[PDB]
Design a protein around this ligand. Structure first.
Ligand SMILES: CO[C@H]1O[C@H](CO)[C@@H](O)[C@H](O)[C@@H]1O
Ligand SMILES: CO[C@H]1O[C@H](CO)[C@@H](O)[C@H](O)[C@@H]1O
Ligand SMILES: CO[C@H]1O[C@H](CO)[C@@H](O)[C@H](O)[C@@H]1O
Ligand SMILES: CO[C@H]1O[C@H](CO)[C@@H](O)[C@H](O)[C@@H]1O
Ligand SMILES: [Ca+2]
Ligand SMILES: [Ca+2]
Ligand SMILES: [Ca+2]
Ligand SMILES: [Ca+2]
Ligand SMILES: [Mn+2]
Ligand SMILES: [Mn+2]
Ligand SMILES: [Mn+2]
Ligand SMILES: [Mn+2]
Lengths: 231, 231, 231, 231
């Protein structure tokens, strides 16, 4: 199977796989069962901001998710990514729906990696219909209002159930190296999760993977397009 | 055929295809016969710096090539790259040898493109044996002393004749867009051209191409790995 | 007197001092009588964007001023800033009103200078009530809605006549050096010029000055807070 | 008294004020008696690199000090800088000598601060004789070989005892804000500490201070130009 490290914005509690009983953010290391979670007051129809940070000094993967004029949710987990990921990775955004659904709209995405110095930075403040520096997988589309729709939306703007989609940056990223004095990365994205129902599902993740990562077959719903099973 | 825009550091005068009778820098628009050239005092065995700049306001492609404690060579050409290149491109470094030879050693390479904002930046201050964000074509290799050798060198660094090699950044670049108020790019690389002979050949280019560009058949020597013919 | 280089967004034609008979953008080199101007379709009450660029290779000062979904205005002038400005400068925004008036509201301001490398970058996407990295001169205030008001506005945002104000970045900038292979700078700001009258005045400038520059006595109205006289 | 947060590269053990019995790096919060230290294998006459990082999510101040082809020294301390520093600060480099001495040569210095976004970045890869974006205090000088000499060196290159000097970046920095979702800073500098004696003293610090900070009178030797006493 693929190797996944992810920050999940989990809109739907699957208590049977160790989700807490509320919308949450989590750090996932090679399992959909988050190593750590924090409560997340998701705001249906409001534009949110996610910031993810890691450096090779602290070896702490941290995420902050916020909306204007509201308290942030934050989660951190000590992990040595050198012992989990291959040296070269791709970075991406993933989303899913199941029997419940939501828009998984990305309005912007930036990423910076630095290895001491080699550097990579990309910034998307808009997505075009033919975004050739993105690998779109499953139901992911670009161009509609200059946004990235990770999961399927009908002609009338309604989100579809049992959908899964991902966008990976085209270039592989050197995420760690033994010869590195300091390695760091950050990602930011803005998202709009809307549900006609007051039961939205299933969420959005920022993930890092083996370069050849693809949607595991059947990874709709609670598996967020990341994992083949709930182990 | 490919679509090429390039800045050439041409170490060998091919007077039969319109080269001036001295080492020169040139701006190449879809031809190896430079639209504009300037005299270049190439310094055998010394580390040089090349800077290339363009913005959609001035629509002027400019390059400066320099060595420490020596006068710069500079060349500029008015061109609307919107009318020459496709919207999506790859960016690269190319080098060749022929009957005469030289090391085509790259010690560092950076690039920034901005479309008003979407942005791409990479910086290589060292190259690793397995540099997965580079597409190596022909004789180009990485890892030897942390450098990028565009053309063939022996175990002792001695350069071989009839060699051609290129390195393209893995991700496609959005170099222009009609809805853009301002588009800009800049590139820097440091190079070491050494020749045992007092007749070095054939040179190094920074180039921008169609995303699927490859070394044209036969394009060793004066064609610099860029062009199928001398038209 | 001070040494000024500026890009003016001139909302009010002073035909008696060589303004063309319409709102215009201009390049000012040590005089309010622009060395070059272009027609500017200023849009009362709409947020606009100004981009200013210069590099030591082309030695061309260029500016583009635009509104969403409208054609740009652009102006360029060939000037060797090495022969005009001192080596060390301050960078700033200036605005004035006279008998006629307008809001001179700055919503954002960024600047980058590079000398080949020494570098300086600042980005203001909001201004606080106590913005200690800004020198406010004359009527300029910060904090109201997180904006920079260069000229006087009432409690309800209504603009006052005979006002002049400037904001300079606190740190001096090394804009040129003889030992530099390449020097470049860029500035971006977003502005909101609103007038209850259909005769707005007098405009906004981005300027570069001697480090100790201050508002010349009397420099309200057509002198834009930049010049002691109309010579 | 001033408010100081610093990372010290302490070359001289003052066992009487709680220094460990070896050259060390430390995190100083309003005292020269480091809240945390790590062993540092200082290499007389070799160019070293120091990296300092902090973000408002982890609230961890970390430093890594390294030489090429040697193991790094690293130190971290959990501190909420929001509870220690004023909102606006200056950032600087400090060094001292006492009865024992050393060159306190800075070859380069970069700093980035970001408040979510407002940003500040400066990079010095060389210092000029008249570096107007630096406030030099005490014995600090610029221009000699393009370096920053924090403490006094004689005409013959010999370091002098009982010397103290600092360089602060001219612009105040917004290092924290209550409305900030994420605040971060990083600093990098390269240094050359040479001693003829083989008993070097006293060290170099990166520090953050109240904007009006100045060398405490008598703060030569073990006080590193930062503190008035050893409390
Ligand atoms: C009720 O179960 C289904 O729907 C939910 C909500 O979408 C998913 O989490 C889950 O994997 C299933 O597809
Ligand atoms: C004279 O013949 C060769 O001359 C140089 C030497 O490298 C090349 O430019 C050219 O294409 C030929 O191969
Ligand atoms: C009569 O003109 C006055 O008003 C205009 C525009 O306000 C200014 O340009 C001018 O200097 C005077 O102050
Ligand atoms: C021996 O004591 C003196 O010299 C050393 C190092 O120079 C300092 O630490 C100390 O403060 C005194 O000035
Ligand atoms: Ca879930
Ligand atoms: Ca040639
Ligand atoms: Ca006017
Ligand atoms: Ca000590
Ligand atoms: Mn979960
Ligand atoms: Mn040529
Ligand atoms: Mn005018
Ligand atoms: Mn100590």
């Amino acid at each position: 199977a693929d190797t996944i490290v992810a920050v999940e914005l989990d809109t739907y509690p699957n208590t049977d796989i160790g989700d807490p009983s509320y919308p949450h953010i989590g750090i996932d290391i090679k399992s959909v069962r988050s190593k750590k979670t924090a409560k997340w007051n998701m705001q249906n129809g409001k534009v949110g901001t996610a910031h993810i940070i890691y450096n090779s000094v602290d070896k702490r993967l941290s995420a902050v998710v916020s909306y204007p004029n509201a308290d942030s949710a934050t989660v951190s987990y000590d992990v040595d990514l050198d012992n989990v990921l291959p040296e070269w990775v791709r970075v991406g955004l993933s989303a899913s729906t199941g029997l419940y659904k939501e828009t998984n709209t990305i309005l912007s995405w930036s990423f910076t990696s630095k290895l001491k110095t080699n550097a990579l930075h990309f910034m998307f403040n808009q997505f075009s219909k033919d975004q050739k520096d993105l690998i779109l997988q499953g139901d992911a589309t670009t161009g509609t209002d200059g946004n990235l729709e990770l999961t399927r939306v009908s002609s009338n703007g309604s989100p579809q159930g049992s959908s899964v989609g991902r966008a990976l940056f085209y270039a592989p990223v050197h995420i760690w190296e033994s010869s590195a004095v300091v390695a760091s990365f950050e990602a930011t994205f803005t998202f709009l999760i809307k549900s006609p129902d007051s039961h939205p599902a299933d969420g959005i993740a920022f993930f890092i993977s083996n370069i050849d990562s693809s949607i595991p077959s059947g990874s709709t719903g609670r598996l967020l397009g990341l994992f083949p099973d709930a182990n």
